[PDB]
Design a protein around this ligand. Structure first.
Ligand code: CYC
Ligand code: CYC
Ligand code: CYC
Ligand code: CYC
Ligand code: CYC
Ligand code: CYC
Ligand code: CYC
Ligand code: CYC
Ligand code: CYC
Ligand code: CYC
Ligand code: CYC
Lengths: 172, 117, 162, 162, 172, 172, 162, 162, 172
């Protein structure tokens, strides 16, 4: 795979050089945030089930037709898939969040997804929507925990967002 | 009379293989990831016998990198190898060979005499 | 590339499950260590050159005949290469310290090591000395955990070479 | 059984390689954390009983009808079972804290959870409340990292149940 | 698999009980030694190659016949296997050492080994010998490192021994 | 696969006819050369290792960038591949030489090789270069043996060349 | 197509190894034999026709009823076919002699033999006689190894047919 | 063990068919060659010793430093081993000549060659010289095909070593 | 696998010695007979179909019951097997005959054969019988061929016998 550290390495390698002092300071800083970073991840994983459950409810309240005969979330079999997919995307996002890098998400998960959805006749728009619904709920937890030392997580929060968005975009 | 869960496994020493981890080759696989599938395949497909440097099959595993062939095709190339023949088939009787092929190709053993025939 | 973080992701991913507490614990380990690791890298990076000179040199003392004409150690081109190579080893080591895993080492240095060396008739032995000599020098500039880390990686190569 | 330590061994073992720095880093993580984990376990172990009573109880408040005759919550045998079960959940959680991994939970509780529950018509919902109620109480006796750990594991089950 | 912690759990489980306070204190203490424990492992892994190399030399100086035509270590192919085996045994031992438990060693490594050796015709006694030769060399390193904070490792050293010995015994 | 004999057959088959006397006389004489043919092959195989070794050295002296960071023969892993490939090509060339037909070389190795190299970002030109370097060295041996009956091998030598060249061309 | 030369190449190719002495020895065997083989082919090729006439004929003597109306041997079309077919067999045999392997025979004649014959109700027996009659004639024009070779291939078919 | 005869059997056996002309041709090759092969073996077997001394010796000339104290070439034990080893190479070569295939070489010498050599730090180079020196001497006692055969096998090892 | 030559080698190897001159002379002689040896094989393969056909007829004329309902060669399915088996055994025997060694026959074919037959309920006695019937027919051809240079094949003939007999014995 790849992640923040490995990435920087690789770049450095092609230049053929030791790591720039500047570049170290990216990583040095990254370390400092770790604890925050971790809690963020922990928050998602802890609430996973819920995040999804929630998003779904809202998705189906909005796009009633998905669950009507002839729609894409009907019948049960399909519905199941739709739920499963949402979850997966989430799973990956989390992974990325820990790594500190989109890659894993892009390569295992997002790559080819649009086209699949297309071929099946799944409405990409709706998928994207779901992803956002998820995003908001997820942030909700990341950003409002209990028994964590109070401080600023914004930086992480935004990066989280981006991941969700890469997803939304590439699917859409 | 109490048994730890997984006592049955620890007796019979099937502990490692009972639930057995699957190895999957994934897209845009790294160089270490492929090395691990190869490692696995040679352990299962070949027998747990020792593959020395000389033994390894360069051309088949080059194709496995760069996704020319899938792992299912990789396994087929391994199975049709001087090396697979030399061990297994050339020394075995057809009953011992067919029973070995079940196992390495599919974890199960042969369910019935018909399958052998 | 194999680092702590990538691995746990991989394992999680294979099973098809979310990162649970198990993995985070592991990650945490990586991050705590980093401070020491990073320190070590700063130290090697700075003294690089000097380490390299010293090593190359050593090798020749250890294997005088190399410098005789018609040998490998002989004539500047070869010496240049010899230098280059060791630089590389070092470079990678630093990388690995920072990445917090052997990953960088495995993929650049180790994989294919044997065959390369065979085809060009580079004797592992040489490299080894280089490393050892290095290890000895590093054993002054560093101390405590930073040191320990440096060693680990240096050795890792010795073992791969041998 | 999945703990940090077992996993790294497993991974090392699969690749066929010695435990190198990569894995030890991870292990170190587990051990550093332990101090907090262990603390949490001491706290749960002590208040066990009280937690259990409270939970069982809660469930009935949440689902009054269970206690009516001809229902599942009704008649002591069932109540006893209900108690027993929750005890178990708790017991395992402690175990997992100490073992430093979800392992204990996975193998005892989670594996086969669904089918058992289906065949005996135990509603996941119930268990969940139990847990939640617990989580809330634990959220007083503990604090900081100890707390955090406790939660993680408690949740892990919630998610498995749901 | 199993290790020190997991094990204690399992015991507790059969009694049907929460962990004894006494029993916690075993684990609590075990943790404290971690650092020592780790370094021990690190020492083996760092010296691996050599440990083996060494042991082998001595093994073959003693049991000349193994390397004579008709012996079990001749010809090359066989020799190679024997070297691989030594490494594997070592590898496991290390694993155990980290786990703080024999199990892993017994199940993956030792389990079946005697019977194999028998079928091959490999002389179990010699194997055992090798294992010991290894043992001594290994301890050598564990016990005499450089740049480590000075203190007492005996406890670990002995446990190491035991692992080696379990090996020796079950093979023999 | 195919070779000189088989080929002629196949042609004859489509005409639906027995082999023309003229055509036999191709094969008749082809046989006569056998011994020479064989020795040629033997010469390559005997010197294989060297041929490659040699070619490589020269390849890297010329195109120094391949072995610099960012080049295609760096790092070790890649280098290894590059060597391996060279060898393979050689192997096939030899095969052809024995068969008395290009087919085996083209079908097994050349068909699609270019494209592979392209996709990877391997510089096809350099590959081709290597193949030639090999060619020259190889001929060197074929053409200058010791303890073989002295005579004219030109005919074979040229055919050898051609094979090398087909390779060079299709890769390039 | 299976000839000596192709096979050794194939075997070498599979293992991924250069052609070593082992294989060349084999090759040497073929090509040495060729001289005899080639001779045989020249002999069959020349007398082809006459062999064919004789054979077809024979078959009818052996199985008179074929020539009666409503049978297979009856009416010129069929006779023409009958001729054609045997020609083929012969043709291929020559090929195989020259190629120095059964290859040509296997791929043209043998593969699918049964089913063809079944679906069109060609009785193997017939062909066989044809061949036998041939074999007998060939047993005059040839001698020594040339002969031996001719037989081998002729038989090979007999066995495949039966 | 890979000899011409075993291979054709194997190939026949795989396809599931009787030995037909194809294979016999090959076999014939092996047998006719044997006369030369056998001759070569008689010649090597007789001069064995002398060849060995000469080789060992050579190696030392080529790599003087080996004989210095603290090196591998130094002290009789090592010299004895060095002798032994080369004897082996020779022994096997003879075998292979007689068996008419590389088989004997592959299984005794070649398989596992690398790792052995790595673990004991035997430099392939040495062996090679030994062989070369040998090849040169053999290039006097033999001539024509006998010679050719001898070379083939000798080389085969050179290539395996390198 | 194994054959006459390889075998002698192996023996020599364990003694640790070059091949004895005496031993060479076994092989030297063996070579001389080659041509005879070959023709023998050729004779079997050429007549294969027939050999079997014949033997079968005789087998069934003797043991009528095998082909009666309740017998082991009935119904068709079984009959087929019985024929198939005969053939195989023959095939191997031939192989051996070429090799100049029983091994191939023993390892591929004879090893476990009895037990198989037993488990199925196949009457080993009858199998053995068949093998002999085959033997005699086969020798018939080996010993009476056409267009071959006349001389003495006895030596080969006897060895052939032995192979057949090893078969008969181990099955029985
Ligand atoms: C960010 C979204 C929210 C937030 C986070 C936050 N966390 C800390 C500090 C820590 N949190 C952890 C968490 C872990 N460390 C581990 O090893 C693991 C896995 C086993 C976890 C879950 C730890 C240990 C710390 C340090 C000590 C502590 O008491 O927290 C902070 C403090 C800043 C820092 O980086 O130390 C903060 C701010 N707080 C919020 O308000 C955000 C919503
Ligand atoms: C070396 C100290 C001694 C020695 C060992 C030896 N072993 C073999 C062959 C095998 N050894 C094993 C053993 C293992 N497989 C495993 O996975 C493990 C660990 C879990 C072990 C220990 C196996 C399976 C083999 C067979 C290898 C194969 O399949 O090819 C040999 C070689 C015997 C042979 O002819 O292959 C030897 C020599 N024997 C000695 O003499 C030393 C004292
Ligand atoms: C120094 C200890 C001795 C020495 C070295 C020497 N090395 C080469 C050639 C190569 N060395 C390497 C090593 C690397 N290249 C890589 O890509 C990596 C990993 C990133 C490593 C470690 C390689 C690959 C080569 C071959 C390519 C090349 O030579 O450019 C030589 C040249 C030998 C030759 O060309 O035959 C030499 C001499 N020489 C000394 O002075 C010491 C004895
Ligand atoms: C409590 C919230 C409710 C309740 C529970 C209840 N449970 C059972 C029966 C079982 N419960 C379990 C659960 C476990 N047993 C285990 O071994 C484990 C893993 C360690 C768990 C989590 C099991 C397996 C059973 C079935 C076997 C058995 O006979 O107990 C019952 C009885 C169900 C029945 O139909 O007989 C009940 C009632 N009781 C309450 O009051 C709550 C509604
Ligand atoms: C025991 C065989 C020898 C010995 C060991 C020893 N080690 C320490 C202390 C530490 N060792 C480590 C090592 C690690 N911790 C990790 O997390 C990792 C993996 C990344 C390693 C390799 C650490 C961090 C410590 C703490 C700081 C320190 O170096 O002291 C001690 C001190 C006692 C303690 O409880 O820590 C000792 C004794 N020393 C010997 O003399 C033995 C031969
Ligand atoms: C060396 C002269 C030049 C060079 C070669 C090079 N090739 C690769 C990668 C591959 N090469 C092949 C090709 C083959 N494999 C086969 O099976 C056959 C016969 C059909 C051939 C000829 C393949 C399969 C690959 C891809 C996967 C693999 O590594 O095996 C590389 C490595 C590229 C990479 O991204 O790893 C290289 C270096 N390139 C040069 O620099 C030289 C000019
Ligand atoms: C040509 C590239 C160079 C050359 C070849 C050459 N060879 C011969 C004659 C023979 N060469 C062989 C070799 C073999 N026959 C085999 O069966 C095998 C594999 C086991 C080999 C390798 C043989 C036996 C002969 C026949 C006579 C002999 O004793 O060599 C010649 C002479 C012409 C001929 O065809 O007989 C020649 C010219 N020597 C050169 O001059 C070229 C540089
Ligand atoms: C001669 C003994 C008898 C005979 C033969 C005959 N053959 C056919 C028809 C076919 N014959 C063949 C045979 C071959 N075709 C091939 O391609 C090959 C391999 C190269 C062979 C051996 C085939 C395929 C056919 C099917 C149709 C066709 O003609 O191609 C017939 C016609 C039977 C019908 O009704 O189709 C006959 C009669 N003729 C005689 O008189 C003899 C009894
Ligand atoms: C001679 C050119 C140099 C030399 C050699 C030397 N060899 C060893 C040790 C071994 N050599 C072999 C070789 C073989 N043994 C086999 O079984 C086979 C296959 C039949 C071969 C080719 C082996 C396996 C060993 C290792 C075991 C043993 O003790 O023999 C040594 C000793 C190395 C050591 O570490 O003690 C030496 C020195 N000696 C010289 O003078 C030359 C430099
Ligand atoms: C014929 C002379 C007698 C006969 C034979 C018979 N055999 C089977 C079944 C099998 N026989 C074998 C044979 C072999 N297995 C091997 O591995 C080898 C060597 C490579 C041989 C020769 C096997 C595998 C089977 C089992 C598979 C199968 O059922 O086809 C049967 C069928 C048994 C049944 O009940 O179906 C028979 C009849 N039996 C006779 O009556 C003759 C005396
Ligand atoms: C023995 C069972 C019967 C017999 C055989 C016999 N054959 C020869 C001589 C030769 N036979 C062959 C046959 C082949 N050689 C090959 O290479 C091949 C496969 C490609 C075959 C089929 C050859 C070539 C010879 C030599 C030339 C010749 O025909 O003379 C003899 C003569 C003895 C001898 O060669 O030393 C004999 C006796 N003849 C009998 O009397 C038996 C019935």
């Amino acid at each position: 795979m790849q992640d923040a550290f490995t990435k920087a390495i690789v770049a450095a390698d092609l230049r053929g050089s030791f790591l720039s002092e500047q570049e170290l300071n990216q990583l040095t800083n990254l370390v400092k945030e770790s604890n925050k970073r971790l809690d963020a991840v922990n928050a998602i994983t802890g609430n996973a089930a819920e995040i999804i459950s929630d998003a779904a409810h809202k998705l189906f309240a909005e796009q009633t037709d998905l669950i009507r005969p002839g729609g894409n979330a009907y019948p049960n079999r399909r519905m199941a898939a739709c739920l499963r997919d949402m979850e997966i995307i989430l799973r990956y996002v989390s992974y990325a969040l820990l790594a500190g890098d989109a890659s894993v998400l892009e390569d295992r998960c997002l790559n080819g997804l649009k086209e699949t959805y297309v071929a099946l006749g799944t409405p990409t728009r709706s998928v994207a929507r779901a992803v956002q619904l998820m995003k908001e709920t997820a942030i909700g937890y990341v950003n409002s925990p209990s028994g964590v030392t109070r401080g600023d997580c914004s930086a992480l929060v935004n990066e989280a967002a981006t991941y969700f968005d890469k997803a939304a975009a590439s699917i859409a | 009379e109490a048994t730890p869960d997984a006592a049955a496994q620890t007796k019979l020493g099937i502990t490692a293989v009972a639930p057995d981890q699957a190895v999957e080759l994934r897209p845009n696989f790294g160089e270490a990831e492929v090395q691990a599938v190869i490692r696995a395949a040679y352990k299962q497909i070949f027998g747990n016998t020792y593959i020395l440097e000389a033994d390894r099959v360069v051309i088949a595993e080059s194709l496995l990198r760069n996704g020319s062939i899938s792992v299912r095709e990789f396994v087929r190339l391994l199975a049709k190898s001087d090396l697979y023949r030399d061990r297994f088939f050339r020394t075995a009787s057809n009953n011992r060979f067919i029973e070995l092929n079940f196992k390495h190709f599919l974890g199960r053993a042969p369910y019935s005499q018909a399958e052998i025939g | 590339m194999k680092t702590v973080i990538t691995e746990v992701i991989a394992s999680a991913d294979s099973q098809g499950r979310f990162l649970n507490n198990t993995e985070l614990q592991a990650a945490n380990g990586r991050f705590q260590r980093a401070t020491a690791s990073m320190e070590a890298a700063r130290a090697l990076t700075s003294n690089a050159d000097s380490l390299v000179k010293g090593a190359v040199q050593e090798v020749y003392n250890k294997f005088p005949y190399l410098t005789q004409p018609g040998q490998m150690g002989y004539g500047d081109t070869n010496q240049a290469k010899c230098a280059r190579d060791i630089s590389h080893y070092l470079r990678f080591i630093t990388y690995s310290l920072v990445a917090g895993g052997t990953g960088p080492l495995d993929d650049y240095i180790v994989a294919g090591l044997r065959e390369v060396n065979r085809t060009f008739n580079l004797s592992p032995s040489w490299y080894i000395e280089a490393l050892k000599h290095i290890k000895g020098k590093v054993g002054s500039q560093l101390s405590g955990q930073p040191l320990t880390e440096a060693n680990a990686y240096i050795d890792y190569c010795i073992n791969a070479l041998s």
